């Protein structure tokens, strides 16, 4: 018999694909994998297949979000068939977006020891979701990053952030990443951008 598929892992690249990978085990003779997906809260059924980690992908329009969906991987070789343990997924929890893009990194006039970052959202992102963010920043010379986190409401159109607690007349390198609030999968960091605080502390 083939090994029992295990270590099933799925990622939803938002409006691109849903990929599930798994540990196939020792592949001793030609094995076919079939990933059986139940979705739309138990009401719809898709499959994808592959052969001799392993990987398999689903696409719009057979994805809905939000969703609770199940995955089981069947392996079949000459000797016979075997199914993995069932796995249970919340799609929003595994949704990954492209990074944001910062276009402006400069302070507001008169206000010391602070920089303001403005960015656009990734072009593809679920409008019916809150976004969380992590902004990493280091000075020109700095080796280690510092990070701060913040959340933005789905309805909040203001895509700025006031970064306080900084040093005067120092230049900071900055990068930004986002994800839906409920997701474990952060975007890749944005491209780095630079800016400088104003002099003084008044």
């Amino acid at each position, epitope marked *: 018999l083939p090994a029992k598929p295990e270590n099933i892992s799925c990622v939803y690249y938002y*409006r*691109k*694909n849903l990929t599930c990978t798994w540990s196939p085990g020792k592949e001793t003779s030609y094995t076919q994998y079939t990933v059986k997906r139940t979705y*739309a809260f138990g*009401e*719809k059924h898709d499959n994808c297949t592959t052969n001799s980690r392993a990987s398999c992908s689903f*696409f*719009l*329009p*057979r*994805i*809905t*979000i*939000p969703d609770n969906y199940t995955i089981e991987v069947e392996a079949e070789n000459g000797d016979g068939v075997i199914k993995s343990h069932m796995t249970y997924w919340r799609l929003e929890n595994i949704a990954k977006t492209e990074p944001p893009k910062i276009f402006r990194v400069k302070p507001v006039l008169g206000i010391k020891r602070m920089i303001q970052i403005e960015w656009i959202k990734p*072009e*593809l992102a*679920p*409008v*019916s979701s809150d976004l969380k963010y992590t902004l990493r920043f280091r000075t020109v010379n700095s080796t280690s990053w510092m990070e701060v986190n913040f959340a933005k409401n789905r309805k909040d159109k203001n895509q700025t952030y006031n970064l306080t607690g900084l040093q005067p007349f120092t230049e900071y390198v900055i990068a930004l990443r986002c994800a839906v609030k409920e997701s474990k999968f952060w975007s890749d960091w944005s491209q780095e951008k630079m800016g400088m605080t104003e002099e003084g502390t008044s």
Partner: antibody
Amino acid sequence: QVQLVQSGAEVKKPGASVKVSCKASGYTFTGYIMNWVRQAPGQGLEWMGLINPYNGGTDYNPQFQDRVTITADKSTSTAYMELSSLRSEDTAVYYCARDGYDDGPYTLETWGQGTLVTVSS
Amino acid sequence: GSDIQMTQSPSSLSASVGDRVTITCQASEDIYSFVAWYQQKPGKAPKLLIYNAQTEAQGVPSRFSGSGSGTDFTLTISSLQPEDFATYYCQHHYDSPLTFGGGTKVEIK
């Protein structure tokens, strides 16, 4: 704002083929399924097929399997619908439509203005 | 590989401004709540009103409501306005192929 702008009217002989374009703007073209639907004069809606511009995957109504090709070009954000072996009963308005609701796939949320295709000598 | 037929009733009706109107859609098979309703004015593209049997599409007046599940679905217009004299289509959105009902034409008495 999401806009779909289709090519102009067509008149084609029986036996010929037609290719209608549908130019998308105001959104990431590859992020949304594009459907094609038609309506013969005074009649109801019939679904023809869709394409996923992300990877070119198509899905066609079996009533036109041998006849319909749907394509998409990422560089011009344009979807296309070709219908060959035209017969008089293919006379209809042909619509492209975006599937845009995250919680409602296979619904048609934004429509082009339509393209009249008349089939006649 | 779906094989779903949608029938609508009636194919036309006559109503007056202010009337409550109900249009019905029947699926040949259990399709849970995966039904959409479209309005088509003369000479215009269809516009989505309802999906998932009951979710209102963006910018739809509240006088439009959908209900039902399984095989039996209704669109109700609580009080018919001049702009609402039009053809209404249902459509399953279960899985391809997609099929539409034959339509209900709401005409002026």
